[PDB]
Amino acid sequence: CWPQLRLLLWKNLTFRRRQTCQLLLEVAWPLFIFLILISVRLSYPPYEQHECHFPNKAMPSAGTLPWVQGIICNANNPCFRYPTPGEAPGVVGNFNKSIVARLFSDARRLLLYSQKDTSMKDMRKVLRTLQQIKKSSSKSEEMIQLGDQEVSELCGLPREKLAAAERVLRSNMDILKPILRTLNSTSPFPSKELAEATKTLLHSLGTLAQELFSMRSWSDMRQEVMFLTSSTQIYQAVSRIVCGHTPYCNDLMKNLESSPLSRIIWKALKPLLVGKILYTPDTPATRQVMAEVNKTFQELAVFHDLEGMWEELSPKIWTFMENSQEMDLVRMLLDSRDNDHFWEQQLDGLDWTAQDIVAFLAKHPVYTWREAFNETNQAIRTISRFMECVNLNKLEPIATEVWLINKSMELLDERKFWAGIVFTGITPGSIELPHHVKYKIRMDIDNVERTNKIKDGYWDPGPRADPFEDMRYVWGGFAYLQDVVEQAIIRVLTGTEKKTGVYMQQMPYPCYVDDIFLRVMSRSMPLFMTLAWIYSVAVIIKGIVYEKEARLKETMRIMGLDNSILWFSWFISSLIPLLVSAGLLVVILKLGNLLPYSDPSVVFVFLSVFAVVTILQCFLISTLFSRANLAAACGGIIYFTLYLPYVLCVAWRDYVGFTLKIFASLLSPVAFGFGCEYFALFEEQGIGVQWDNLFESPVEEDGFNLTTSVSMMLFDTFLYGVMTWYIEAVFPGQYGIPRPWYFPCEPTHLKLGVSIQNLVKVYRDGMKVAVDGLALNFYEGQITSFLGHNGAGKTTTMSILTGLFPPTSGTAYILGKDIRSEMSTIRQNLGVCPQHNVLFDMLTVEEHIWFYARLKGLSEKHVKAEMEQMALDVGLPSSKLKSKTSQLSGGMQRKLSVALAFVGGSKVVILDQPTAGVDPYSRRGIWELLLKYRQGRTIILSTHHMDEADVLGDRIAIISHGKLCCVGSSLFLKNQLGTGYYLTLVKSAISNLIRKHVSEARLVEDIGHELTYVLPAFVELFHEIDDRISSYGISETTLEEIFLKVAEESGKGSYQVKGWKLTQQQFVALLWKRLLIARRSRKGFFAQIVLPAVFVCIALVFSLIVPPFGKYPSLELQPWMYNEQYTFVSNDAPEDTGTLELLNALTKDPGFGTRCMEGNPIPDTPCQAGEEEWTTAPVPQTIMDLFQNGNWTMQNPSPACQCSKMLPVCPPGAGGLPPPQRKQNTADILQDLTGRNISDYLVKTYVQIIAKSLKNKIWVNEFRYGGFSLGVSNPSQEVNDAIKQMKKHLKLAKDSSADRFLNSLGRFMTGLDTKNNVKVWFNNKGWHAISSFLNVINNAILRANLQKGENPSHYGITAFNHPLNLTKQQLSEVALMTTSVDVLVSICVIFAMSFVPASFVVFLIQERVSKAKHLQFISGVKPVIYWLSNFVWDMCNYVVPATLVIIIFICFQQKSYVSSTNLPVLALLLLLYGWSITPLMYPASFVFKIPSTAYVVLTSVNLFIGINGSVATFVLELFTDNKLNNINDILKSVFLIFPHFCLGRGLIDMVKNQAMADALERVSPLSWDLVGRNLFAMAVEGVVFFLITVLIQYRFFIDEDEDVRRERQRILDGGGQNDILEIKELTKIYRRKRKPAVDRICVGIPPGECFGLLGVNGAGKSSTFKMLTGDTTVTRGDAFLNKNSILSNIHEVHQNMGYCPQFDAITELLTGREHVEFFALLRGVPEKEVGKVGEWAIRKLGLVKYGEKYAGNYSGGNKRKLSTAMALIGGPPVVFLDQPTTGMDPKARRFLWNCALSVVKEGRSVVLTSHSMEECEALCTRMAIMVNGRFRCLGSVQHLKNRFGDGYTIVVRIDLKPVQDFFGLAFPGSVLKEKHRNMLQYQLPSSLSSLARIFSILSQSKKRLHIEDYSVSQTTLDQVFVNFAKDQ
C-alpha cells in the first residue's frame, strides 16, 4: 500500500508545484486576518494602570453635608494613585479643605459665640448710662456749610482757624468751649463707672471683630463666586468651592443637561431633587418610619425657609446698619486717639485694621457694608430660586402593591421616580414591629444593578471602577435610600437619637493591567476562526468533487488503486498545507502578542487536531454530492450552519449540561469553538496552557474542559470517517456499484475472458431504453470489434463492464469474476481508455505514463523501459513528453489515452473509440501497438472506422439499440450477409454500358462522386471501363456496406430581421434559454439560490432561542451568596466610648448578620454553630526580616513591591503580619485588623492570595468582598442651647419664617457631628456586596443600640433588591446583547449574499471553456446584448433570494431591519448590492478554466473582504476612544471600493440607528452619512463594472511545392474578384514555443467548390480555424471573408460564417431542437419560421429519436450531428467544418456528405477538415495537406492522385510469406508497405496498364493460395496521406 500512497503523494506534490500561487493563497488565507489582527493590536498595547485608591463616599447617616460632598467630589473615581487620608483609621473627614465645611463650622462658631455673647447688653447699658448721666448725646450760611462739611474729630479746629483767618477773634473764645469736648474723645474721662463700662464694651467689640475676621470663609466664598461669574477653569473653581484640590428651574435643569461638569454628577442628582419615593399601606409603624425618613430628608431643607428669614429680618438688619445709635457710638469708639491703639493691641497685628473696619462699616451715603449686603441678598435669592421647584415632599402613601407598581409606572412616565420601599407588615395595626423587618427596594433597572447575576462570570482584572456602568449603587440612589431606611428602622426599634456615621470605601486594586484587546479576542476568536477554514473546506470539497466527477478518481481506481489509499493520500495532501498554516498561525499568535501566556506547542497540537477534524468533515461533505458546481456552494454553507449550535449554546449559557454540550459538539464545529473560548478565558486570566492546565478549565461547571474537547474531536473524527466510508459505499453518486444497505451486517479453445449476460441499463432521465440484451463473449487472444451506431450501447456497455455505470439487469463475468460483487478484483487487472480524454492537466505526458506504470507495480527501470516502448510504438515525436497535456491537440491526447491503457500488466483492455480525430498515419502505429499486445490482453475494439475493425478485429460484433445483431469474424459476416463485387469509380450512359456488358448490374448509392455499383464477362467489362473517370477500383463486400445493411434492417428563412428587432429577438432568445436552463436544473438552483436563504433562516432560528427577559427575581442583600469570602474587622481607637459596644455586638451570638437567629430566614443557607477561638495563622520563618527591620511607621508598614503578568510577584512577607482568624458561625472567617494599615495590608494579601491560588491553576475567583473599620471622629446640646438663646432673644416670635428657619438650622447643625463611625470597605467586583455589607453593619448597629433586651438574636433587618419588571431589562445589557446578535446576523447575511452572485459566473465558464459563447458570437449576437441578458437574468436570480430573505426578516419581526423606516431602505440596499456585485463577478471567467474553482475563489474573496471590513470598521468605531478611528473613516472611503463592505456598513448603520433610537426612547437611514452613500456608491460601481466588463469583452480596443507557390503568387499579385475566402500569409505563433503552428498560408476559395484541409495531428488546422472565426489572435497576414477583413471588422465576417468546432460546444440542459431554434433566433430567423427551419435542420441530419432529448446526454455521433446542424443554420456562404465526422457511424457521415453536397450545390463553400481519407476523396473538390503549418499539394483530388501517385494499389487479407512470394513472382516491382499480421498492401506503378489483367491473374490464383479477401483501388488517398506523413 506504500508505493501507491507515495505515488499519489508525489502527484499531489507535482500538482502543488505547478500551481504555487494557489498553495500560497491557501496557506496565507488565515495569515491575512491574523496580520490585520496583530497590526491593530500593535496600536493598542496593554495599558499599565497604576495602583490607585478610591475616596470614601459619605452616607446620609453621617450628615447631609458630607453626603452631598461625597456625591459631588468622588463622582468619577479619580484614582488619586495614593492612599487618601479618608482610608486612614484615625481621620475620616477628608473634606476639611473645602470652603463649604469651613463656612458651616464658622457659622456654628458664630452661633456659639452669640450664645456666649453679651456685647449687645454691654452697649445697651453704655447707651443707658450715657443717657442717664449726660442726657445730651444726639457769613452765616458760609460758616454753617463749612461747619457741616468739616464736622469731624479734628476738622472743627481747622474750620475755626480758617474762619478766624478772615474774621475777628469773636469766634475764637467759643472755640475754647469745643476744645474741651474734642468731638466726644475725652468725654469718658469725666465719669468713673462709664470708663469701666466703655472698656468692657471695647473688649467685647474687639473679641467680636476678631472672631468675625478670623472666620475667613465668607471672603473665599465671595472671591470664588465672583471669579466663577468660558473654559475648563470653571471646573477647578467649582471643585475648590465644593471640595478641596416653574419654567426657571426647568431652564436650569436644561442648562445642567448640557453638562458643563461631570455627567455622573447630574446623573446622581437627578433622582435626588427630582425623583420621588413611595411605600406600602399606611401602617402606623410604617408611618413613623416614613416620618423619620422625611425628617432625615428635610434636614437638608434649611434653604427652603431661608427666604422667609430673609424676607422678615432684612428690614431690621437694614435699619440696624443705617440709623441705629448703637452703631453710631460704635463708630465713635472706633476712631479716637487711643482707641486705635487699643484696637491694634487687641488685633494682635492681624489684617483688616480699624481703618478697614471703619471703611467697611461706616458709610452714610469703594467697598462697604452696602455692596456686601447686596451680594448676600443676591446669593439668598439665587439659593431660594434653586430650591424652589425641588420636590422635598417625596412621600406618597399607596394602598397595595399593584397600585404601587402602577404609580411607579406613572411617575417614571413623568421622569420623576426614586426607589420604593415595600415592607412586609402582617396587619396595619399599632404594633411596634415584628422584630424582623423584611423590606424590598424596588426601583428602575437603569439606576440599580442587575440582579439576574451576582458576579461578572469569568474572572478578569479590574476593580470595576466605572462610575456609570458598574457603580449604579452610588449614583442611582439605592445605597443612600437603603441607609436612610435602615437608620429609620433602627431609630424606631430602639429610640436612640444619636446615629453612628457610615462611610463606604471602595477596595483599591494592585496596579492591574487592562487589555480591551483581550476582551475583543475572547468575544471574536470563534468568529474570526471560521472564515479562514471555510475557505479551506470550500477548496478541499471543490477539488475532491471535481476529481471524482471528471472520472479521474474512477479511472485511477480502474488502473489499480483502491479507495483507502486515495483517501489517505487526500488526507495527507490536505493536512500538510493545513499543518504549515497552523504552524504559521501559532507563530503569529505567539509573536503578535495575541496569545502570549499560552504555550505554542499546545496551540499547535490543538490546531492540528482541529485540522484533522476539518479534513474528515470535508470528506464527509464531499461524499454527499457528485457535481462540483453544487458542492462549491454547499460545502461552506453546511460548515457554517453546523457552527450555529455553538452560538446557540453561547447565547444560552444556562440549563445546558455536560451531556447536552457533548451532543451539541457531536457535529464538532462547537468543540473547536469551546476550545477557542477556553483558550481566550485562560489568556484573559493571564495563565495560558503550559501543558498542565489541561483537564481543568471550569468557569462555572463540573467537567467540561479542554481535554474533553480534544477527546470529543477524536471521537468525532472516528465517527466522520466511519460515516464517510459508509456513505461512499452506499451513496457514491453516479459512478458506483453501489453497496447494499445491509452491509456489513465460436472458439471453444480460448480462455473466454469477458462474457456478458442480458445486460440492461436504464438512465433516470426518461428510462432511456437503450440496452435491451447482450450475450457477447470476449476471448483472450482475439480483438472483438464492438461496433454499433450512434446510441447503440457501446460506451454504456464498456462503462458497465468497468466500475462506471451499474447494470439494471443481467451480469458480466470478466475472467470468471463477476462485476456486481468482485469489482475491485477485476479492476486490479483492468485497463481502460474511454471515449473522452480523462487525464490530468498539470501533469505532462512522461509524468502521466510514469504514474500509470508505477500504479501497477513495475520497477523504476521497468517503468522507464515501458515509457520508452510506448513512446516509440504509439508515435510520439519525443518532443511532447515534457509538455503539459492541456496544450496537446485531440490526436495527441487520444494517442496518450490509448497508450495509458496498455502500460503495465492488464489482461483485460477496454478501448472506447481509440481513434477519434487521429490521422491515418498514427492510426497505423495504433494498429501495430494493438497487434503487438494481442497475446492475452483481451483487446476490445470499439471504433467507427470499418478498415480498422476489419483488419484488427478477428471476431467483430455489430449491435443496434442494445440488442445483438451479428457476431463473428469477417468471413462469417461476409459470406452470410450480402456479398458481391462493389465497383466504385469517380465521375445515364454509364449505367447502360455496364448493363449491356454484364447481366446483373444495380446502382445502390451516388453520394460525392462515388457511384457505387454492385455485381453479384467481368474481364471485358473492366476493359470497357478502362479503355473509355481514370479511376477504376473494385472490392469485395467490405465492412462499410455490411454495417450499412445491418443498420438499415434495424432553410434560412425569408425575412432576416436586423436592427432593434433582431436585438430584441436575440434578447428574448437568451432569456428563454436561461429560463430553460434554470427550469431543468432544480438541484443547482436550490443549492446556489435557495440554500443561502435557508442558511439565513436557520441562523435567525438559532438566534431566536435566546433566553427570555423581563424576569428579575428578588435578590436578598446578604453577603452569603459567595461561598468562600474573607471578612476583616478593624477596631480603631478602642476607648470604650461608642466603638467597643458595636464591636462586641458585631461578633456575638446574633452573628455577622441575620443569617441564623432563632431560625434561618434566608433560603438554602445553613450556618455553622460551633466555632469560637482566636488563633493566629502559622507564619513561616520570615519574622526576622520584619523584627530586625523594625520601627515600621504607619506609612509603608510592609516592604512595598514594584509593578513592572497581571499582578506583581515578590517574596512572602507582603502583608507583614498574619492576623488571628476566627470563624463567626457564618461560614466565613474574620481577621482582626486592630492597629494595622488597611489599604496596604489588603492590597498585599490580595496579591499573595491571587498568586498562590493561581500557581496551582484553580481558576482564581474573588478572595474578599467586604470588611468593617470602626472608629471615632475628632456638640449637640451646645448648639441646641445656642439656637434656643438666639430664638428667645432679639424679638422672639412664633411665625413660620424665623422660628422654623432657626429650628431647621439647629437640626442641620446637630446632624453633622458623629460620636462614632464605621467605614465599610467593599470590593466593587461583587455586584451586590456593598448593599449587603451595608445591611450587615446596620444590623450590627441595631443589635448594639438595643438596651437591656432578653437576647439580641431575634432582632434584625433584611433588605431585598427587586428591580422593576415594567418594560425593559437594562441599558448596557441589551446594548451589548442586541448589538452582538445583530452583528452575527449581519455577518450571516453577508455570507449568504456573497455565496449567491459568485455562481453567476459558473454558467459563464460553462460557456467560455467550450465554444458555445464563441458560437453565439459567430451569430449576429453582439457582446453587449449577451451581457445585458445575463445581467437581467442574474438580477432576477438575485432578487428571488433577496425577496426570500426579506420575507424571512419580516416573519422574524427583526425590528432592526424590517421597521417602518428600514424595510424599503434594506430592500434598496440589497438591490443595489446585487446590481453592483454582478458586473464585478462578471469579469472573472476570462482567467479561470474551471467553474467550481472560480466559484470557490470568488465566494471566498467576497466573504473575506466583506466580513473582515465590516468587523474591522465595527471594532474601530465602537471600542476605540483614540483618534485612530478617524483614519478608519478615510479607510472607509478606500473600503468603499468593495460593494460587500458597503452592504455590511449599511447593515451596521441600520443597527446602530435602531440602537440609538431605542436609547433615545429609554433619524432616517436614507441620509448621506448613512446607507444613502452606500446606495450611490453601489450604483456608480455597478455602472463602472458593467462598462469595464464590456471593455474586457472587447479587449479594451473596440522552396515549397510548385502548386503551393503558384497559388501563393496568384493570391499576392492579383486579388480574387469572386472568391469568398481569401487568406494571405496567415501566421500563428503561440507563446513560449518559438515554433509557429501555422505560417504562410495564402488560399482562395471560390463560391462553387468544396475545400478540404487535411493534415497530421498537430499540423495547424484548428489554429487556422480559430483565427478565421476569431477565437485566437492572428499574428501575420489577413483573411478576407466576403470582402471583409478580420482585424478590421469581425461582425461582418461572423454574419456570413458557419462554424463547427472540433470539440462539442453544446448546453448540457438543452435539447437538439431547442439548440437549433435558439441558434436560428440568434441569426435573425423570424419567429414565424423558427419551427420550420428547426425541423428542416433536424431532419436533414437524422436525430429523429434524439430531437427531444437533452444534448448533454447525447452520444458520440449525435453531438457531432447537432454541431453540424447548428453550423448549417442561416445558410452562410462559407461553412467551416472542423472534424465533423469524429466517432460517427457511416450513416451519419453519409448524411453529412449529403448536407455538404446540398450546401455546395446551393452556391456556397465548405472548408472541411477530417481524418478519414475516403470522405475528402469523395466529396471534397480542392484539397490541401498541411504539415507543421505548410501546405504540400494544394490541388484537386484527381490532380493529387495523378501528380503524387500512379498505377493501382492492392489490399489483400488472409500464412503470410507465400503471399509475398506470389506478389514478388507475378509482379516484378511491388513495394510492400504497411505490413500487418492480417492484411497486406502492394503498389502497381512499377508494372504495366490494363488493371483487368492483374484482376484476372489474381482471380486465377485465388484458389491455389490461402487469400481470404482482395480489393483493388486506383491510387486511393490513404496511401497518399501515409506517404505524405512518412516524408516529414
Ligand X SMILES: Nc1ncnc2c1ncn2[C@@H]1O[C@H](COP(=O)(O)OP(=O)(O)OP(=O)(O)O)[C@@H](O)[C@H]1O
Ligand Y SMILES: *[C@@H]1O[C@H](CO)[C@@H](O[C@@H]2O[C@H](CO)[C@@H](O)[C@H](O)[C@H]2NC(C)=O)[C@H](O)[C@H]1NC(C)=O
Q: In the structure grid, which three cell numbers stand for residue 1495, read together?
A: 466559484
835 part of the interface to Mg ion, by CB under 5 A: yes
Alpha-helical regions (H) of 167-246? 170-173, 176-179, 193-214, 218-228, 233-242
Q: Which CB sits closer to ligand X, 562 or 1671?
A: 1671
User: Which of 736, 917, 1053, 1352 lies at the binding interface for ligand X (CB under 6 A)?
Assistant: 917
790 or 1915: CB nearest ligand X? 790
653 or 1562: CB nearest ligand NAG = 1562
Residue window 233-252: x/- pattern of binding to Mg ion, with contact defined by CB under 5 A = --------------------
Helix, strand, coil fractions of the chain, as percent rounded to 5: 50, 10, 40
CA 1716 to chain centre: 46
1648 binds, among ligand Y, Mg ion, ligand NAG, none (CB under 5 to 8 A by kind): none
**Using rule CB under 5 A, residue 1702 touches Mg ion:** yes
The residue range among 463-471, 1247-1255, 1280-1288, 1656-1664 that interacts with ligand X, by the rule CB under 6 A, is 1656-1664
Distance CA 792, CA 1755 (A): 9
Interacting residues with ligand NAG between 1238 and 1277 (CB under 6 A)? 1274
Minimum distance of ligand X from residue 891's CB (angstroms): 3
Question: By rule CB under 5 A, what count of residues binds Mg ion?
Answer: 7
**Residue 91 binds to ligand NAG (criterion: CB under 6 A):** yes
Give the dihedral sign, CA 1752/1758/1763/1767.
negative
Considering only residues 1704 through 1763, tell me which ones interact with Mg ion, judged by CB under 5 A. Answer: 1756
Q: Which is nearer to ligand NAG, 5 or 91 (CB)?
A: 91
* Residue 1658 binds: one of ligand NAG, ligand X, Mg ion, none (C-beta under 5 to 8 A by kind): ligand X
- Among ligand X, ligand NAG, ligand Y, none, residue 763 binds (CB under 5-8 Å by kind): ligand X
Question: Binding to ligand NAG (CB under 6 A): which residues in 1358-1397?
Answer: 1365
Closest contact distance (angstroms) between CB of 297 and ligand Y is 5
How far apart CA 1669 and CA 1647 sit, in angstroms, is: 18
Give the dihedral of Cα atoms 726, 728, 734, 739; nearest 10 deg.
Answer: -40
Shortest spacing between CB 889 and Mg ion, in angstroms:
5
Give residue for cell 493529387.
Answer: 1840
Q: Determine, following the binding rule CB under 6 A, whether residue 244 of this chain makes contact with ligand NAG.
A: no
Q: How far is the CB of 419 from ligand Y (least distance, A)?
A: 17
Residue 101, binding choice from ligand X, Mg ion, ligand Y, none, Cβ under 5 to 8 Å by partner class: none
- The binder of 724, among ligand Y, ligand NAG, ligand X, none, by C-beta within 5 to 8 A per type, is none
Using the minimum distance from each CB to ligand Y, give the nearer residue, 272 or 940: 272
Closest to ligand X by CB, 891 vs 1363, is 891
- Which of the ranges 81-89, 103-111, 764-772, 1340-1348 carries the binding residues for ligand X, by CB under 6 A? 764-772
Q: What is the DSSP letter of 1107?
A: P
List strand residue ranges (DSSP E) for 877-1018, in order.
908-912, 939-942, 956-960, 963-968, 981-984, 1002-1005, 1012-1015
Compose the 1627-1646 pattern: x for residues touching ligand X by CB under 6 A, - for all others. ---x------x---------
Are the beta carbons of 1642 and 1621 closer than 8 angstroms?
Answer: no
- The C-alpha atoms of residue 1183 and residue 1203 are separated, in whole angstroms, by 24
Q: Confirm or reject binding of residue 127 to ligand NAG (CB under 6 A).
A: no
Distance, in Å, from the CA atom of 1287 to the CA atom of 1334, rounded to the nearest integer, reads 39
The distance of closest approach from Cβ of residue 1047 to ligand X in the complex, given in angstroms and rounded to an integer, is 12
CB closer to ligand X out of 1435 and 1629: 1629
Is residue 48 close enough to count as binding ligand X by CB under 6 A? no
Least distance to ligand X from the beta carbon of 1637, Å? 4
Which residues, at least 6 apart from 287, have a Cβ–Cβ distance to it below 8 Å? none
Residue with Cβ nearer ligand NAG (85 or 1648): 85
96 binds ligand NAG (CB under 6 A): yes
Contacting residue, 5, 22, 36, 85, with ligand NAG by CB under 6 A: 85
* Shortest Å distance, C-beta 526 to Mg ion: 53
- Binding-site size for ligand NAG (CB under 6 A) equals 6
d(CA 957, CA 1048): 16
Query: Which stretch in 157-165, 889-897, 1565-1573, 1692-1700 sits in contact with ligand X by CB under 6 A?
Result: 889-897
- Measured on CA atoms in the order 128, 132, 133, 138, is the torsion positive or negative? positive
| Contact flags string 1765-1804 toward ligand X, x per CB under 6 A | ------------------xx--------------------
Contact in structure between 1308 and 303 (CB atoms under 8 Å): no
If one asks whether residue 795 binds ligand X (CB under 6 A), the answer comes out as yes
> Given the rule CB under 6 A, which of 39-47, 1017-1025, 1567-1575, 1750-1758 is the region that contacts ligand X?
1750-1758
457, 1446, 1897, 1920 from 1883: Cα distances, Å: 100, 81, 15, 11
- Selected range binding ligand NAG among 42-50, 88-96, 339-347, 1777-1785, rule: CB under 6 A: 88-96
Q: Identify which of residues 298 and 452 has a Cβ nearer to ligand Y in the complex.
A: 298
1810 part of the interface to Mg ion, by CB under 5 A: no
Residues that bind ligand Y (CB under 6 A): 294, 297-298, 301, 304-305, 392-393
Q: Give the Cα separation of 1025 and 994 in Å (integer).
A: 8
Which DSSP category does 1167 fall into?
Answer: P
Range list of H helices, 299-424: 306-310, 313-320, 325-334, 339-347, 354-361, 369-386, 401-413
Is 977 an interacting residue with respect to ligand NAG (CB under 6 A)?
Answer: no
Q: What is the DSSP string of 26-67?
A: HHHHHHHHHHHHHHHHHTSPPEE------PEEEPGGG-HHHH
Specify burial of residue 568 (Cβ count, 10 A radius: 0-12, 13-18, 19+).
Answer: middle
CB of 91 vs ligand NAG, minimal distance in Å: 5
One-letter amino acid at 1215 equals G
Closer CB to ligand NAG, 404 or 1214, in the complex: 404
Size of the site for ligand X (CB under 6 A): 35
Query: β-strand 1034-1036 against 1115-1116: which pairing, if any?
Result: unpaired
Which of 276, 945, 1661, 1804 binds ligand X (CB under 6 A)? It is: 1661
Cα(1330)–Cα(1323) distance, integer angstroms: 8
Beta carbons within 8 Å of 1305's beta carbon, 6+ residues apart:
302, 1283
Q: Which does 1757 bind (CB under 5 to 8 A by kind): ligand NAG, ligand X, ligand Y, none?
A: ligand X
Classify residue 771 by its DSSP letter. B
Question: What residue type is assigned to position 670 of the chain?
Answer: V
The CB-based long-range contact list for 170-178 (8 Å cut-off, 24+ gap) reads none
Distance CA 177, CA 174 (A): 5
**d(C-alpha 668, C-alpha 665), whole Å:** 5
CA-to-CA distance for 1084 and 1400, rounded, in angstroms? 12
Look up residue 608 and give its three cell numbers. Answer: 492540528
The residue within the footprint of ligand X, chosen from 791, 1326, 1636, 1770 (CB under 6 A), is: 791
| 96 contact, one of Mg ion, ligand Y, ligand NAG, none, CB 5-8 Å limit per kind | ligand NAG
- In the complex, minimum distance from the CB of residue 1081 to ligand X, in angstroms, rounded to a whole number: 14
Residues 464-483 that bind ligand NAG (CB under 6 A): none
Q: How many CB atoms lie within 10 A of CB 1679?
A: 22
* Residues near Mg ion (CB under 5 A): 794-795, 835, 913, 1662, 1702, 1756
* Residues near ligand X (CB under 6 A): 763, 765, 768, 770, 788, 790-796, 835, 887, 889-891, 913, 917, 1630, 1637, 1657-1663, 1702, 1753, 1755-1757, 1783-1784
